[PDB]
Amino acid sequence: EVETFAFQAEIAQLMSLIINTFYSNKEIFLRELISNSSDALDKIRYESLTDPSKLDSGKELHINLIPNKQDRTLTIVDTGIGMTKADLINNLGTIAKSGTKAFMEALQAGADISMIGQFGVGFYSAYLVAEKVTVITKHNDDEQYAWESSAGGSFTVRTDTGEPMGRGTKVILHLKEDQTEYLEERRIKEIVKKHSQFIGYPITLFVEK
Ligand SMILES: CN(C)Cc1cc(O)ccc1Br
């Protein structure tokens, strides 16, 4: 069972601005996704402070970076609070309608695309380097769902029968053919050190055979 939804107009517009605007500093995507994972890890740590059993689905709070050269995917895994189905449909838990409005007004007033995270829609920077994005997520109060979009004005949501995650969120970036540099160990490591060096969670860069 696969449901297909239209993006709100303002979100589709933000997505095509990100895809079409000439802008060379594409590496900020990794900082924005990592920062979103860190925010979701803060959220489940804070709930665990008064209710320990919110960690029965995973005591470990971490972020993993997993490049796969055969599939041409970069996967960002976190064991944060995760997302309910309604969250996924509602622009992946963001206020994307009003953040895009403020983001685009800023762009006309001195801002550049690298400031997208200040307006809450940093996730969509994923499309600076990905032609398709898949978000697997599991929240304590809901089942495991798969969100998927290749832009073009729509996204799908389905129940994910893949590997149980326990709790957290997985962003699979199907990279564009000319963005494979973000699969290389030394290039990911440079970006993490440049932009994410004070994230309060361990970031493990997986290696490949
Ligand atoms: C924005 N990237 C990292 C996906 C994501 C992770 C979360 O932990 C929560 C929401 C989203 Br979308």
Side-chain angles (χ1 to χ4, degrees), residues 140-166:
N140 280 337
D141 302 339
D142 208 352
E143 307 318 312
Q144 196 160 306
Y145 284 100
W147 177 105
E148 191 157 76
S149 186
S150 291
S154 74
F155 66 91
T156 69
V157 173
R158 79 203 57 191
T159 293
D160 181 50
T161 54
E163 217 56 85
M165 265 183 326

PDB file of all heavy atoms in Angstrom, residues 140-166:
ATOM      1  N   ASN A 140       8.271   6.122  18.788  1.00  0.00           N
ATOM      2  CA  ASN A 140       7.759   5.213  19.822  1.00  0.00           C
ATOM      3  C   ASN A 140       6.248   5.012  19.718  1.00  0.00           C
ATOM      4  O   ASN A 140       5.741   3.930  20.032  1.00  0.00           O
ATOM      5  CB  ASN A 140       8.083   5.736  21.229  1.00  0.00           C
ATOM      6  CG  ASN A 140       9.508   5.435  21.674  1.00  0.00           C
ATOM      7  OD1 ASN A 140      10.154   4.513  21.179  1.00  0.00           O
ATOM      8  ND2 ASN A 140       9.997   6.218  22.637  1.00  0.00           N
ATOM      9  N   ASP A 141       5.515   6.043  19.297  1.00  0.00           N
ATOM     10  CA  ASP A 141       4.059   6.031  19.283  1.00  0.00           C
ATOM     11  C   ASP A 141       3.463   5.592  17.928  1.00  0.00           C
ATOM     12  O   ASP A 141       2.270   5.823  17.688  1.00  0.00           O
ATOM     13  CB  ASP A 141       3.536   7.422  19.671  1.00  0.00           C
ATOM     14  CG  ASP A 141       4.025   7.885  21.048  1.00  0.00           C
ATOM     15  OD1 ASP A 141       4.430   7.033  21.875  1.00  0.00           O
ATOM     16  OD2 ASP A 141       3.998   9.113  21.306  1.00  0.00           O
ATOM     17  N   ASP A 142       4.248   4.962  17.051  1.00  0.00           N
ATOM     18  CA  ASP A 142       3.789   4.650  15.698  1.00  0.00           C
ATOM     19  C   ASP A 142       4.662   3.546  15.103  1.00  0.00           C
ATOM     20  O   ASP A 142       5.635   3.095  15.715  1.00  0.00           O
ATOM     21  CB  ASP A 142       3.814   5.897  14.806  1.00  0.00           C
ATOM     22  CG  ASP A 142       2.786   5.839  13.688  1.00  0.00           C
ATOM     23  OD1 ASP A 142       2.158   4.772  13.505  1.00  0.00           O
ATOM     24  OD2 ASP A 142       2.622   6.856  12.977  1.00  0.00           O
ATOM     25  N   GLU A 143       4.320   3.138  13.879  1.00  0.00           N
ATOM     26  CA  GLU A 143       5.025   2.084  13.158  1.00  0.00           C
ATOM     27  C   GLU A 143       6.105   2.665  12.240  1.00  0.00           C
ATOM     28  O   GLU A 143       6.232   3.882  12.060  1.00  0.00           O
ATOM     29  CB  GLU A 143       4.049   1.241  12.328  1.00  0.00           C
ATOM     30  CG  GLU A 143       2.837   0.648  13.062  1.00  0.00           C
ATOM     31  CD  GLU A 143       3.154   0.073  14.446  1.00  0.00           C
ATOM     32  OE1 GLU A 143       4.136  -0.694  14.570  1.00  0.00           O
ATOM     33  OE2 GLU A 143       2.406   0.374  15.409  1.00  0.00           O
ATOM     34  N   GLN A 144       6.877   1.765  11.633  1.00  0.00           N
ATOM     35  CA  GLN A 144       7.989   2.160  10.780  1.00  0.00           C
ATOM     36  C   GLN A 144       7.481   2.516   9.385  1.00  0.00           C
ATOM     37  O   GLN A 144       6.880   1.679   8.709  1.00  0.00           O
ATOM     38  CB  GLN A 144       9.027   1.042  10.706  1.00  0.00           C
ATOM     39  CG  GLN A 144      10.390   1.507  10.167  1.00  0.00           C
ATOM     40  CD  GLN A 144      11.501   0.554  10.544  1.00  0.00           C
ATOM     41  OE1 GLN A 144      11.686   0.249  11.715  1.00  0.00           O
ATOM     42  NE2 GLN A 144      12.234   0.065   9.553  1.00  0.00           N
ATOM     43  N   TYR A 145       7.754   3.744   8.937  1.00  0.00           N
ATOM     44  CA  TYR A 145       7.265   4.220   7.652  1.00  0.00           C
ATOM     45  C   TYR A 145       8.427   4.612   6.746  1.00  0.00           C
ATOM     46  O   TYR A 145       9.535   4.910   7.205  1.00  0.00           O
ATOM     47  CB  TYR A 145       6.304   5.405   7.829  1.00  0.00           C
ATOM     48  CG  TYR A 145       4.923   4.985   8.312  1.00  0.00           C
ATOM     49  CD1 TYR A 145       4.567   5.110   9.657  1.00  0.00           C
ATOM     50  CD2 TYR A 145       3.985   4.453   7.434  1.00  0.00           C
ATOM     51  CE1 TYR A 145       3.309   4.722  10.104  1.00  0.00           C
ATOM     52  CE2 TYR A 145       2.730   4.061   7.877  1.00  0.00           C
ATOM     53  CZ  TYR A 145       2.402   4.198   9.213  1.00  0.00           C
ATOM     54  OH  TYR A 145       1.158   3.819   9.668  1.00  0.00           O
ATOM     55  N   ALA A 146       8.151   4.608   5.443  1.00  0.00           N
ATOM     56  CA  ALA A 146       9.106   5.031   4.427  1.00  0.00           C
ATOM     57  C   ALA A 146       8.507   6.192   3.648  1.00  0.00           C
ATOM     58  O   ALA A 146       7.476   6.029   2.985  1.00  0.00           O
ATOM     59  CB  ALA A 146       9.460   3.875   3.481  1.00  0.00           C
ATOM     60  N   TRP A 147       9.147   7.353   3.737  1.00  0.00           N
ATOM     61  CA  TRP A 147       8.859   8.516   2.906  1.00  0.00           C
ATOM     62  C   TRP A 147       9.847   8.534   1.744  1.00  0.00           C
ATOM     63  O   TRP A 147      11.025   8.213   1.923  1.00  0.00           O
ATOM     64  CB  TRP A 147       8.983   9.792   3.755  1.00  0.00           C
ATOM     65  CG  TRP A 147       8.784  11.128   3.083  1.00  0.00           C
ATOM     66  CD1 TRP A 147       7.686  11.934   3.176  1.00  0.00           C
ATOM     67  CD2 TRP A 147       9.740  11.849   2.278  1.00  0.00           C
ATOM     68  NE1 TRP A 147       7.890  13.099   2.470  1.00  0.00           N
ATOM     69  CE2 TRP A 147       9.140  13.063   1.905  1.00  0.00           C
ATOM     70  CE3 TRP A 147      11.041  11.580   1.841  1.00  0.00           C
ATOM     71  CZ2 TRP A 147       9.790  14.000   1.106  1.00  0.00           C
ATOM     72  CZ3 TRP A 147      11.682  12.513   1.043  1.00  0.00           C
ATOM     73  CH2 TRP A 147      11.059  13.706   0.686  1.00  0.00           C
ATOM     74  N   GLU A 148       9.373   8.901   0.555  1.00  0.00           N
ATOM     75  CA  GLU A 148      10.234   8.894  -0.624  1.00  0.00           C
ATOM     76  C   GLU A 148       9.822   9.993  -1.592  1.00  0.00           C
ATOM     77  O   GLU A 148       8.631  10.178  -1.855  1.00  0.00           O
ATOM     78  CB  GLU A 148      10.176   7.545  -1.348  1.00  0.00           C
ATOM     79  CG  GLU A 148      11.242   7.392  -2.427  1.00  0.00           C
ATOM     80  CD  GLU A 148      11.553   5.946  -2.732  1.00  0.00           C
ATOM     81  OE1 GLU A 148      10.728   5.302  -3.415  1.00  0.00           O
ATOM     82  OE2 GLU A 148      12.609   5.451  -2.272  1.00  0.00           O
ATOM     83  N   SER A 149      10.808  10.694  -2.160  1.00  0.00           N
ATOM     84  CA  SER A 149      10.479  11.677  -3.184  1.00  0.00           C
ATOM     85  C   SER A 149      11.642  11.899  -4.143  1.00  0.00           C
ATOM     86  O   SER A 149      12.806  11.926  -3.734  1.00  0.00           O
ATOM     87  CB  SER A 149      10.074  13.014  -2.557  1.00  0.00           C
ATOM     88  OG  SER A 149       9.637  13.908  -3.566  1.00  0.00           O
ATOM     89  N   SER A 150      11.314  12.072  -5.424  1.00  0.00           N
ATOM     90  CA  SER A 150      12.276  12.507  -6.428  1.00  0.00           C
ATOM     91  C   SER A 150      11.984  13.925  -6.896  1.00  0.00           C
ATOM     92  O   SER A 150      12.358  14.293  -8.011  1.00  0.00           O
ATOM     93  CB  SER A 150      12.292  11.545  -7.623  1.00  0.00           C
ATOM     94  OG  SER A 150      12.841  10.289  -7.255  1.00  0.00           O
ATOM     95  N   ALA A 151      11.331  14.721  -6.051  1.00  0.00           N
ATOM     96  CA  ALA A 151      10.809  16.034  -6.404  1.00  0.00           C
ATOM     97  C   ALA A 151       9.747  15.852  -7.475  1.00  0.00           C
ATOM     98  O   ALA A 151       9.033  14.841  -7.473  1.00  0.00           O
ATOM     99  CB  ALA A 151      11.924  16.978  -6.873  1.00  0.00           C
ATOM    100  N   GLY A 152       9.625  16.808  -8.395  1.00  0.00           N
ATOM    101  CA  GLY A 152       8.534  16.720  -9.352  1.00  0.00           C
ATOM    102  C   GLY A 152       7.150  16.904  -8.766  1.00  0.00           C
ATOM    103  O   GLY A 152       6.160  16.537  -9.410  1.00  0.00           O
ATOM    104  N   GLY A 153       7.043  17.466  -7.564  1.00  0.00           N
ATOM    105  CA  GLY A 153       5.763  17.853  -7.018  1.00  0.00           C
ATOM    106  C   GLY A 153       5.060  16.829  -6.150  1.00  0.00           C
ATOM    107  O   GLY A 153       3.953  17.116  -5.663  1.00  0.00           O
ATOM    108  N   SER A 154       5.648  15.652  -5.930  1.00  0.00           N
ATOM    109  CA  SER A 154       4.956  14.637  -5.149  1.00  0.00           C
ATOM    110  C   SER A 154       5.938  13.832  -4.306  1.00  0.00           C
ATOM    111  O   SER A 154       7.150  13.824  -4.547  1.00  0.00           O
ATOM    112  CB  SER A 154       4.147  13.692  -6.044  1.00  0.00           C
ATOM    113  OG  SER A 154       5.006  12.799  -6.740  1.00  0.00           O
ATOM    114  N   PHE A 155       5.378  13.146  -3.308  1.00  0.00           N
ATOM    115  CA  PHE A 155       6.108  12.228  -2.447  1.00  0.00           C
ATOM    116  C   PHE A 155       5.173  11.082  -2.095  1.00  0.00           C
ATOM    117  O   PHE A 155       3.948  11.217  -2.173  1.00  0.00           O
ATOM    118  CB  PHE A 155       6.642  12.918  -1.175  1.00  0.00           C
ATOM    119  CG  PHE A 155       5.564  13.399  -0.225  1.00  0.00           C
ATOM    120  CD1 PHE A 155       5.096  12.582   0.797  1.00  0.00           C
ATOM    121  CD2 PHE A 155       5.053  14.689  -0.327  1.00  0.00           C
ATOM    122  CE1 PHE A 155       4.121  13.031   1.687  1.00  0.00           C
ATOM    123  CE2 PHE A 155       4.076  15.146   0.562  1.00  0.00           C
ATOM    124  CZ  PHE A 155       3.612  14.315   1.573  1.00  0.00           C
ATOM    125  N   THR A 156       5.761   9.943  -1.726  1.00  0.00           N
ATOM    126  CA  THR A 156       4.984   8.774  -1.337  1.00  0.00           C
ATOM    127  C   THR A 156       5.306   8.397   0.101  1.00  0.00           C
ATOM    128  O   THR A 156       6.387   8.697   0.620  1.00  0.00           O
ATOM    129  CB  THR A 156       5.237   7.556  -2.257  1.00  0.00           C
ATOM    130  OG1 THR A 156       6.568   7.059  -2.054  1.00  0.00           O
ATOM    131  CG2 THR A 156       5.049   7.926  -3.730  1.00  0.00           C
ATOM    132  N   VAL A 157       4.337   7.758   0.747  1.00  0.00           N
ATOM    133  CA  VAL A 157       4.495   7.205   2.085  1.00  0.00           C
ATOM    134  C   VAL A 157       3.960   5.782   2.060  1.00  0.00           C
ATOM    135  O   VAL A 157       2.897   5.525   1.487  1.00  0.00           O
ATOM    136  CB  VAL A 157       3.769   8.042   3.158  1.00  0.00           C
ATOM    137  CG1 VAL A 157       3.829   7.341   4.499  1.00  0.00           C
ATOM    138  CG2 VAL A 157       4.404   9.428   3.276  1.00  0.00           C
ATOM    139  N   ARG A 158       4.717   4.857   2.645  1.00  0.00           N
ATOM    140  CA  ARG A 158       4.308   3.469   2.738  1.00  0.00           C
ATOM    141  C   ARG A 158       4.822   2.911   4.053  1.00  0.00           C
ATOM    142  O   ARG A 158       5.797   3.406   4.627  1.00  0.00           O
ATOM    143  CB  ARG A 158       4.834   2.635   1.557  1.00  0.00           C
ATOM    144  CG  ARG A 158       6.302   2.234   1.687  1.00  0.00           C
ATOM    145  CD  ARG A 158       6.935   1.929   0.343  1.00  0.00           C
ATOM    146  NE  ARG A 158       6.817   3.061  -0.568  1.00  0.00           N
ATOM    147  CZ  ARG A 158       7.091   3.011  -1.865  1.00  0.00           C
ATOM    148  NH1 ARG A 158       7.505   1.894  -2.442  1.00  0.00           N
ATOM    149  NH2 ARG A 158       6.954   4.113  -2.602  1.00  0.00           N
ATOM    150  N   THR A 159       4.133   1.883   4.530  1.00  0.00           N
ATOM    151  CA  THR A 159       4.629   1.079   5.635  1.00  0.00           C
ATOM    152  C   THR A 159       5.908   0.373   5.215  1.00  0.00           C
ATOM    153  O   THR A 159       5.940  -0.321   4.195  1.00  0.00           O
ATOM    154  CB  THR A 159       3.574   0.053   6.050  1.00  0.00           C
ATOM    155  OG1 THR A 159       2.447   0.733   6.614  1.00  0.00           O
ATOM    156  CG2 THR A 159       4.141  -0.931   7.057  1.00  0.00           C
ATOM    157  N   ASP A 160       6.962   0.544   5.997  1.00  0.00           N
ATOM    158  CA  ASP A 160       8.249  -0.045   5.660  1.00  0.00           C
ATOM    159  C   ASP A 160       8.362  -1.434   6.273  1.00  0.00           C
ATOM    160  O   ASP A 160       8.355  -1.581   7.499  1.00  0.00           O
ATOM    161  CB  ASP A 160       9.388   0.849   6.135  1.00  0.00           C
ATOM    162  CG  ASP A 160      10.744   0.284   5.795  1.00  0.00           C
ATOM    163  OD1 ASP A 160      10.958  -0.081   4.618  1.00  0.00           O
ATOM    164  OD2 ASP A 160      11.594   0.208   6.709  1.00  0.00           O
ATOM    165  N   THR A 161       8.478  -2.446   5.416  1.00  0.00           N
ATOM    166  CA  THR A 161       8.716  -3.823   5.828  1.00  0.00           C
ATOM    167  C   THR A 161      10.195  -4.189   5.826  1.00  0.00           C
ATOM    168  O   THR A 161      10.530  -5.370   5.978  1.00  0.00           O
ATOM    169  CB  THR A 161       7.950  -4.793   4.919  1.00  0.00           C
ATOM    170  OG1 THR A 161       8.290  -4.536   3.548  1.00  0.00           O
ATOM    171  CG2 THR A 161       6.448  -4.625   5.112  1.00  0.00           C
ATOM    172  N   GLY A 162      11.081  -3.211   5.641  1.00  0.00           N
ATOM    173  CA  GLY A 162      12.505  -3.458   5.710  1.00  0.00           C
ATOM    174  C   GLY A 162      12.991  -3.733   7.119  1.00  0.00           C
ATOM    175  O   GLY A 162      12.193  -4.030   8.017  1.00  0.00           O
ATOM    176  N   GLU A 163      14.300  -3.625   7.319  1.00  0.00           N
ATOM    177  CA  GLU A 163      14.922  -3.951   8.597  1.00  0.00           C
ATOM    178  C   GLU A 163      14.333  -3.120   9.734  1.00  0.00           C
ATOM    179  O   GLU A 163      14.338  -1.886   9.649  1.00  0.00           O
ATOM    180  CB  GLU A 163      16.432  -3.722   8.495  1.00  0.00           C
ATOM    181  CG  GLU A 163      17.273  -4.736   9.247  1.00  0.00           C
ATOM    182  CD  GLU A 163      16.994  -6.168   8.819  1.00  0.00           C
ATOM    183  OE1 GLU A 163      17.605  -6.616   7.826  1.00  0.00           O
ATOM    184  OE2 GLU A 163      16.181  -6.851   9.481  1.00  0.00           O
ATOM    185  N   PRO A 164      13.794  -3.746  10.784  1.00  0.00           N
ATOM    186  CA  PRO A 164      13.385  -2.995  11.975  1.00  0.00           C
ATOM    187  C   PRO A 164      14.501  -2.094  12.490  1.00  0.00           C
ATOM    188  O   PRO A 164      15.661  -2.505  12.598  1.00  0.00           O
ATOM    189  CB  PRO A 164      13.056  -4.101  12.987  1.00  0.00           C
ATOM    190  CG  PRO A 164      13.079  -5.412  12.227  1.00  0.00           C
ATOM    191  CD  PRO A 164      13.222  -5.104  10.779  1.00  0.00           C
ATOM    192  N   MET A 165      14.135  -0.857  12.836  1.00  0.00           N
ATOM    193  CA  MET A 165      15.098   0.120  13.325  1.00  0.00           C
ATOM    194  C   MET A 165      15.065   0.332  14.833  1.00  0.00           C
ATOM    195  O   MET A 165      16.044   0.845  15.391  1.00  0.00           O
ATOM    196  CB  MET A 165      14.855   1.474  12.667  1.00  0.00           C
ATOM    197  CG  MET A 165      15.680   1.764  11.447  1.00  0.00           C
ATOM    198  SD  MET A 165      15.261   3.427  10.936  1.00  0.00           S
ATOM    199  CE  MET A 165      13.528   3.455  11.398  1.00  0.00           C
ATOM    200  N   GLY A 166      13.963   0.004  15.494  1.00  0.00           N
ATOM    201  CA  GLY A 166      13.829   0.304  16.908  1.00  0.00           C
ATOM    202  C   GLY A 166      13.288   1.695  17.185  1.00  0.00           C
ATOM    203  O   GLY A 166      12.164   1.836  17.676  1.00  0.00           O
TER     204      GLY A 166
END
